[PDB]
């Protein structure tokens, strides 16, 4: 299964898939790099037998709580992994918060994100974040 | 954790959560009822310590392939579980297909769905489906 | 064109289409009822020749600013009008805010809404809002 | 108002805003370039008084029918215009089709798109489309 390994976005987030078999996979998701306070558990599913010549449909979930922080939000990513020699994952993501009944309309944010095997340079991360941080960065 | 148990929508789909602990849960998802050919594995995450007076943020994923069928698609649900005496889960869902590069724009469908502990009557399921089937029903 | 007229949701919002011709339409959108401080200009487009036996694809936009308030947000609705004797509009909506570059990830909320020709009772509006206000209600 | 003028994406689509005043704007949208058969009418709204230091919230709609073609779909874009010396519009889009009641779940596609004042080179358009066409390209 091709989704195994480490994946980077353009803003400095890192997803690590540690195990993948029979349509399920598991790992971690860090919005930062190398700090146990913004790493979180990840779980997902994938198409274990994709149609010839197409990408591999994928999806996964991350609850933004660990032993050190709780943002009271959970994100899901939905998209596909594209092999070839240039490996990519293209997704749209949703981030949902727990709310009171009156605040249910402002419970879910929507965005997009793209992952690559090529770790971007720190210079590229700074230019990209300056144009805008488009991946979820929930505080506190 | 409140999400344990069986959940129904208004169109005849059934989600069963068999295990939930430390922010993770697992189970099955059936678009039909009681037939091993449209049951699929489910995995997700939830907020294990929600803020007082708010709903519990949740998310989960289902790959639409089993031993009998493969739709080449994977769905993710994002929303929150609301306790009280009237227990509900309100979500928005995404369904992503594997595609060629030229077809990437038509890879992801978007919708909404609401789950209840009250199993609807067959009469209510028929009236609801006649107004429109708004939950994912991917063929073949 | 069938979209002409007045449309209600279940939470107390009212959309009035005053003119519709050649694929375009115009009107107003009130999150309240009968108060010039939460009425806003609406503009949209529709399919002027839908396929036989299908709904009519629609879309429209509302900027949440008038002479009395400005929420600094703009919403878009996307879906279809369904005729027959029971007329409905089913949509998903997006609400986007202006942000700094660092806050771009929290710029867009996502939701769903359904419109009917039947004005709901005030009792039905209160029960529905108590279960949750799922249409956009941006403050200030 | 800054949104006036011509905007390009990375896949070869062109949006022209011909008029903008008092929170409304109008123009055209071409998925191709310079051919009256894939140009369509556009209408939208914007925040006419954005908060200092933030982007300008925007939204607009395009029905994919003209005198020569009808795709039976309507798209909406939701996001914000960002000024400075590097002018951009970042959006998420929805494309909704008219359907039968049973097919309502597959009525709406979701995607993302980014617009610039810099017209990309034909070489850049080909490389980008080869990685994937991520803007709406509805056939027939």
């Amino acid at each position: 299964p091709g989704i195994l390994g480490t994946w980077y976005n353009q803003l400095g987030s890192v997803m690590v898939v540690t195990r993948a078999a029979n349509g399920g996979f598991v790992g971690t998701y860090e919005s930062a790099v190398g700090n146990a306070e913004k790493r979180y558990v990840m779980t997902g599913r994938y198409d274990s037998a994709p149609a010839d010549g197409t990408g591999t449909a994928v999806g996964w979930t991350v609850a933004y709580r660990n032993a050190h922080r709780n943002a009271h939000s959970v994100a899901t990513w939905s998209g596909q992994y594209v092999g070839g020699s240039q490996e990519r994952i293209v997704t749209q993501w949703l981030l949902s918060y727990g709310t009171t009944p009156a605040d249910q309309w402002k419970s879910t944010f929507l965005g997009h994100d793209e992952f690559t095997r090529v770790k971007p340079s720190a210079a590229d991360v700074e230019k990209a974040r300056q144009l805008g941080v488009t991946s979820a960065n929930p505080p506190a």
Side-chain angles (χ1 to χ4, degrees), chain A:
Chain A
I3 51 161
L4 207 69
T6 305
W7 296 94
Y8 310 89
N9 72 353
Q10 281 313 288
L11 304 162
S13 321
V14 178
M15 168 170 65
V16 174
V17 182
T18 49
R19 170 154 182 73
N22 296 89
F25 67 103
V26 70
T28 59
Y29 189 98
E30 324 161 357
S31 268
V33 177
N35 47 315
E37 281 189 350
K38 320 186 83 202
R39 191 153 25 88
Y40 312 89
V41 168
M42 178 272 289
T43 188
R45 308 284 297 169
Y46 66 95
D47 183 358
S48 48
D52 178 69
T54 68
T56 294
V58 288
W60 73 89
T61 317
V62 171
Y64 279 107
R65 166 181 174 81
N66 57 30
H68 312 287
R69 327 183 171 296
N70 189 358
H72 298 299
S73 38
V74 181
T76 75
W77 287 257
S78 172
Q80 64 179 311
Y81 154 89
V82 174
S85 310
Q86 185 175 4
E87 286 186 293
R88 276 169 310 133
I89 309 180
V90 287
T91 71
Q92 318 270 338
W93 58 259
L94 306 169
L95 178 75
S96 274
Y97 283 85
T99 75
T100 60
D103 291 349
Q104 286 191 1
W105 63 273
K106 52 184 201 158
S107 166
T108 312
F109 294 99
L110 160 74
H112 75 94
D113 214 353
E114 301 81 41
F115 300 91
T116 169
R117 302 284 204 190
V118 179
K119 182 194 230 258
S121 68
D124 289 352
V125 164
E126 179 181 326
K127 301 172 121 24
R129 288 178 80 80
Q130 183 58 88
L131 293 184
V133 180
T134 56
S135 67
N137 186 65

